[PDB]
Amino acid sequence: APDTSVSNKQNFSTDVIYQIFTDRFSDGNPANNPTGAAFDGTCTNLRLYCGGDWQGIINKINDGYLTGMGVTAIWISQPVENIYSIINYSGVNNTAYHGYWARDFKKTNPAYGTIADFQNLIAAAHAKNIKVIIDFAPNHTSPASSDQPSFAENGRLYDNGTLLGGYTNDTQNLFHHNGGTDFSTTENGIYKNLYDLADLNHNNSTVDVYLKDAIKMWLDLGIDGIRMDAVKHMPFGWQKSFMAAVNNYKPVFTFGEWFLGVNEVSPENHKFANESGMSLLDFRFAQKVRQVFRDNTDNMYGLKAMLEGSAADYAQVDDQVTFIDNHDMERFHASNANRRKLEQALAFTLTSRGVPAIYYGTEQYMSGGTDPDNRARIPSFSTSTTAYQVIQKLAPLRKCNPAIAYGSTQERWINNDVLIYERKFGSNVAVVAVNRNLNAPASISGLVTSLPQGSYNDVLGGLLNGNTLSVGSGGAASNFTLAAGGTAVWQYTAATATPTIGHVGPMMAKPGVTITIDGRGFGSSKGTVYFGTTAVSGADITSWEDTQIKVKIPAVAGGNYNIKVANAAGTASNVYDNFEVLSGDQVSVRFVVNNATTALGQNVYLTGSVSELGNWDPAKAIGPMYNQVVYQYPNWYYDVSVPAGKTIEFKFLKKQGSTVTWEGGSNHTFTAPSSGTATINVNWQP
Ligand SMILES: OC[C@H]1O[C@H](O[C@H]2[C@H](O)[C@@H](O)[C@@H](O)O[C@@H]2CO)[C@H](O)[C@@H](O)[C@@H]1O
Ligand SMILES: OC[C@H]1O[C@H](O[C@H]2[C@H](O)[C@@H](O)[C@@H](O)O[C@@H]2CO)[C@H](O)[C@@H](O)[C@@H]1O
Ligand SMILES: OC[C@H]1O[C@H](O[C@H]2[C@H](O)[C@@H](O)[C@@H](O)O[C@@H]2CO)[C@H](O)[C@@H](O)[C@@H]1O
Ligand SMILES: [Ca+2]
Ligand SMILES: [Ca+2]
């Protein structure tokens, strides 16, 4: 199948995602609507159920709303059973309409539909080449109080109907009882409650095994991807172990929510996206798009630095899910705003690197402040808006123009208000010119591109006041005027002769797991695939076609490898780096080291005998370790994904910058559990 196939669960870079708050989209089956105080059919009270369901989505998938817009994937609210309580928060009634208050991850929220409804949703979507992403929020259950067990459902957790436990009398330690986080440190936000949400303890084996089994049920139901909630709030090591359970079973595109504020750039965020086994929602891209196009708090140079910085910071920048707004921001379109600002921000996102995501109703110019005001029912299903047309014209290019799906990004012309950038992949090119200045045109001269000689019509057809471009020898464009608020897209497409890799997924799995290598010019006959210097060919290459290769990971030692392919004639492709071969199935193990005193600016890290612990390379040690919450300095702790059942030798390190101090004495040893979790507690050896 081609890289662009609906069947490709590992690559969403050629797709355009439409994020749907299920309850607020379309009530296709009134019979499953919640009743009484939990319901508002008029959807005036945005905190109660308005009736939106899976049957309504199936309807809008079948009547052309989404397909006519060029949407090729949907990301829907968490599908699992939620508590039924109507929680009164200081005089105001609140319902689980959002799907974030799970009670049973093995069942459906009956308000959305049954299991059968879900299967129908999956089938209806696939029949229309639309992929289905589900939200999954394994960080907590629901609002709970230990001392007031009658409040809400006491964060109770069930396993397909069977009670596992609640927040009160949590003798099993299913949850954390450390108070609530003030978001003051990352450690603090991981091990303390988010608001009043009962925080799940992933170090509890029952919780661990349960969540990993629950996701398998969803994978079996045919989902194509997962949107993980609150990733900055669960142990990174446990999450890596959770991504390995997914990938070592049935891999699907996964991205997590890790909020970043205006002007925030977090190296922690980068390393997570780079090493966890899941990518992230691109808040850095989104917040910068809002400053430049929405709020006027930064200009094109700042958009350019974000583009260049992110391409450098994210190992797979093309896996980052971009957007201009979501359920946790004020709607991009301000009631009083010029619509062109939204149109432009949209055109920019759709033609930029990564995986574009559109919040439902953006194409309808919905406006609204923060929660729950950004979550109104979609007021119209009109295909006639300028915004809808922009998406319609640009969304499909991610499938037909691989420069947009996988290309590099290059600035070709720039000033405070204008940015002309170029995407390129193999024999494919796309050039986009944007003039944020809504009152002043710009005179464009000296623009040089990789576009072949000729006249190029604006793909948007002048919809956003774009123009035709004339390119001469050298890719030099003749002078032109870029209209006020003008936006234009020019492209060139042709068959690619040399093997070129545009994407790899999943990026972490154990040997034997099948990976998907997508791009152009692989040719029709099986060639060779390389993992580092190791060559794979023949039977282990399950399938091979010009744009997509399916191959089994060889049984090489656990570690990081660069992927390269060669065609049947032996011509090599570019190298796609950072593939991580796991040492085997993974379990989440908590390491604890006592009496590891440090100087300010120095932290403790873990290193050891397996690739999962960096193979004794301080440059790859695990950390920095924690020392506030579960244990207190000078005792440090950290949850780490390690190979199940393996006997592993380890040591702790004190690092400052790249300077390293090793624990003295002999290595410590332990044998990882074959399943579930474990905790190893040792003393720092001088
Ligand atoms: O001609 C090559 C040149 O193109 C662009 O330079 C623009 C510049 O961004 C504008 O602000 C203005 O000065 O016109 C220049 C071209 O005449 C690229 O930005 C630049 O890197 C490139 O060398
Ligand atoms: O909270 C983490 C903190 O740990 C390390 O600092 C120790 C410090 O070395 C001791 O001198 C003492 O002051 O307790 C600190 C922890 O409260 C790291 O030095 C520091 O960078 C890190 O944030
Ligand atoms: O480099 C491989 C080597 O790393 C670790 O050895 C440490 C040792 O523990 C330290 O006390 C100090 O001497 O530095 C060595 C690294 O240069 C592992 O302990 C050892 O097994 C491993 O082979
Ligand atoms: Ca309904
Ligand atoms: Ca947590």
Side-chain angles (χ1 to χ4, degrees):
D3 62 327
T4 55
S5 178
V6 69
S7 89
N8 190 354
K9 309 179 182 272
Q10 290 74 52
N11 174 350
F12 273 72
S13 305
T14 72
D15 301 280
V16 164
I17 303 169
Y18 189 76
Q19 171 195 184
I20 295 170
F21 245 66
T22 301
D23 181 60
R24 315 284 151 95
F25 194 58
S26 185
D27 180 11
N29 177 14
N32 58 29
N33 284 5
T35 75
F39 187 74
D40 178 9
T42 72
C43 207
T44 295
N45 187 341
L46 300 186
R47 311 197 156 67
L48 281 2
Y49 277 92
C50 306
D53 50 37
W54 291 336
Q55 175 70 54
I57 300 174
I58 284 163
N59 284 345
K60 302 309 301 168
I61 279 176
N62 288 159
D63 72 15
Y65 187 66
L66 304 175
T67 49
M69 203 188 322
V71 160
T72 62
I74 53 172
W75 147 23
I76 68 186
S77 314
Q78 185 170 225
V80 316
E81 192 193 31
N82 265 216
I83 66 166
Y84 299 91
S85 333
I86 293 207
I87 302 171
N88 175 98
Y89 282 124
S90 247
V92 210
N93 277 346
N94 288 282
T95 64
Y97 78 90
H98 45 75
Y100 290 118
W101 294 345
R103 109 201 268 294
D104 196 330
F105 299 85
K106 279 188 209 191
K107 292 207 231 200
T108 68
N109 173 329
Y112 300 164
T114 61
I115 290 273
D117 286 335
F118 191 82
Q119 299 175 129
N120 296 154
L121 181 45
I122 294 292
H126 291 172
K128 296 270 174 338
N129 298 323
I130 296 178
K131 293 183 198 168
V132 173
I133 293 145
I134 58 156
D135 232 296
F136 201 64
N139 174 69
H140 54 265
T141 37
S142 54
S145 189
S146 181
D147 51 296
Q148 172 179 1
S150 89
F151 169 64
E153 302 192 4
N154 195 238
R156 284 189 278 279
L157 182 72
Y158 296 79
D159 181 1
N160 190 20
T162 301
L163 187 57
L164 289 189
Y167 204 63
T168 299
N169 298 312
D170 180 24
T171 42
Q172 269 165 107
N173 242 82
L174 298 187
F175 315 84
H176 281 139
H177 299 273
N178 296 311
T181 189
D182 62 337
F183 302 102
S184 70
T185 62
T186 301
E187 167 171 3
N188 192 281
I190 292 177
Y191 301 100
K192 283 173 204 214
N193 293 349
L194 285 189
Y195 307 120
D196 58 356
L197 296 156
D199 210 55
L200 287 166
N201 182 2
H202 305 94
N203 175 59
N204 169 290
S205 266
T206 293
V207 171
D208 177 61
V209 169
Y210 167 79
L211 288 177
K212 283 160 181 186
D213 281 341
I215 201 44
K216 292 201 244 247
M217 156 174 170
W218 296 100
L219 285 173
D220 279 349
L221 276 166
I223 64 173
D224 309 295
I226 302 158
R227 204 296 299 216
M228 297 273 287
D229 177 69
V231 304
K232 193 186 179 186
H233 309 282
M234 294 181 273
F236 303 159
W238 174 76
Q239 305 192 64
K240 169 183 171 166
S241 88
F242 175 88
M243 282 316 309
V246 169
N247 295 355
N248 290 335
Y249 177 56
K250 283 157 143 153
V252 299
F253 182 76
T254 311
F255 53 108
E257 168 154 22
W258 178 317
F259 181 94
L260 294 177
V262 184
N263 302 305
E264 171 180 16
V265 171
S266 158
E268 252 197 343
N269 172 113
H270 305 158
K271 179 159 196 179
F272 185 77
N274 291 349
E275 304 187 21
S276 65
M278 87 181 64
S279 58
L280 289 165
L281 275 171
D282 208 330
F283 275 83
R284 179 178 177 184
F285 174 102
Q287 300 279 19
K288 184 61 70 198
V289 166
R290 289 191 159 236
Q291 290 183 279
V292 178
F293 294 103
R294 190 190 190 257
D295 313 323
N296 189 37
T297 40
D298 196 2
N299 59 27
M300 294 310 189
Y301 297 102
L303 195 69
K304 161 174 148 123
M306 173 280 289
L307 285 174
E308 307 192 333
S310 68
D313 300 336
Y314 291 106
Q316 293 87 236
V317 76
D318 317 274
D319 277 333
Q320 313 312 314
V321 185
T322 56
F323 54 103
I324 81 177
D325 72 8
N326 65 23
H327 51 291
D328 290 328
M329 317 196 145
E330 298 211 340
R331 319 220 37 156
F332 190 97
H333 190 59
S335 245
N336 47 272
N338 188 312
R339 308 188 154 200
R340 176 56 53 88
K341 310 216 279 197
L342 183 143
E343 288 142 20
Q344 281 197 334
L346 233 45
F348 174 79
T349 305
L350 291 169
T351 57
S352 288
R353 85 298 183 277
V355 181
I358 302 187
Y359 189 36
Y360 80 98
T362 293
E363 67 288 357
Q364 298 307 327
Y365 310 90
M366 295 177 69
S367 334
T370 48
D371 181 12
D373 301 292
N374 43 15
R375 300 120 97 125
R377 163 181 289 154
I378 188 165
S380 169
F381 283 129
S382 170
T383 71
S384 295
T385 75
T386 294
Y388 187 108
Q389 291 181 252
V390 161
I391 302 164
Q392 178 185 272
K393 300 282 186 30
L394 303 175
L397 313 179
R398 306 203 67 92
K399 292 270 180 224
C400 66
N401 191 333
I404 287 152
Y406 311 127
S408 48
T409 300
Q410 180 184 186
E411 175 267 298
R412 320 241 51 173
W413 209 100
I414 189 184
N415 74 14
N416 284 171
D417 304 307
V418 177
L419 179 59
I420 305 187
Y421 56 96
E422 174 173 279
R423 308 296 305 296
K424 170 113 169 165
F425 183 82
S427 303
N428 302 273
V429 179
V431 184
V432 188
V434 190
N435 179 13
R436 49 114 66 141
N437 200 321
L438 269 25
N439 302 108
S443 165
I444 294 109
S445 63
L447 169 68
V448 164
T449 72
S450 300
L451 275 187
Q453 213 154 259
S455 180
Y456 287 90
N457 285 339
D458 168 27
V459 177
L460 281 166
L463 178 72
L464 305 185
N465 309 104
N467 52 288
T468 286
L469 187 74
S470 304
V471 175
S473 40
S478 67
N479 303 156
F480 69 100
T481 288
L482 182 56
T487 309
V489 180
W490 310 289
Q491 57 166 347
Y492 187 77
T493 45
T496 299
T498 73
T500 316
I501 297 170
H503 191 269
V504 183
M507 288 297 279
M508 183 198 63
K510 72 182 177 186
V513 165
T514 298
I515 67 167
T516 310
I517 304 181
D518 291 314
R520 290 307 184 279
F522 303 146
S524 53
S525 273
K526 289 192 184 171
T528 310
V529 182
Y530 303 79
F531 285 76
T533 64
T534 297
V536 170
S537 60
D540 279 16
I541 288 179
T542 318
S543 57
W544 184 296
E545 64 177 79
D546 194 81
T547 79
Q548 175 169 105
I549 296 151
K550 233 95 130 122
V551 56
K552 297 196 171 180
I553 300 172
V556 292
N560 210 83
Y561 297 80
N562 296 341
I563 310 301
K564 189 180 81 206
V565 309
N567 61 8
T571 303
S573 73
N574 50 305
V575 174
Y576 199 93
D577 54 47
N578 203 41
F579 182 86
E580 171 182 7
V581 176
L582 297 172
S583 295
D585 295 311
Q586 307 283 305
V587 284
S588 190
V589 170
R590 164 162 313 158
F591 289 78
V592 184
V593 58
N594 312 282
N595 326 322
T597 73
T598 47
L600 234 163
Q602 187 169 63
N603 289 286
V604 176
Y605 291 74
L606 159 67
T607 177
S609 58
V610 282
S611 56
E612 284 86 351
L613 266 21
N615 272 320
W616 305 116
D617 182 346
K620 290 154 202 246
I622 304 285
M625 294 182 75
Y626 294 155
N627 63 9
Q628 294 149 24
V629 192
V630 188
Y631 296 87
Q632 289 80 232
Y633 172 93
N635 291 344
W636 304 61
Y637 69 102
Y638 211 64
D639 304 340
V640 183
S641 180
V642 301
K646 304 272 265 201
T647 290
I648 300 153
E649 298 200 345
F650 64 107
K651 241 169 193 223
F652 290 90
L653 312 175
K654 281 172 187 176
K655 288 192 46 211
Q656 176 152 3
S658 50
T659 295
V660 38
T661 299
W662 288 80
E663 224 186 331
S666 271
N667 290 341
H668 302 267
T669 304
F670 94 113
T671 288
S674 67
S675 97
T677 56
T679 297
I680 317 150
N681 214 312
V682 307
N683 293 307
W684 168 280
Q685 293 166 180

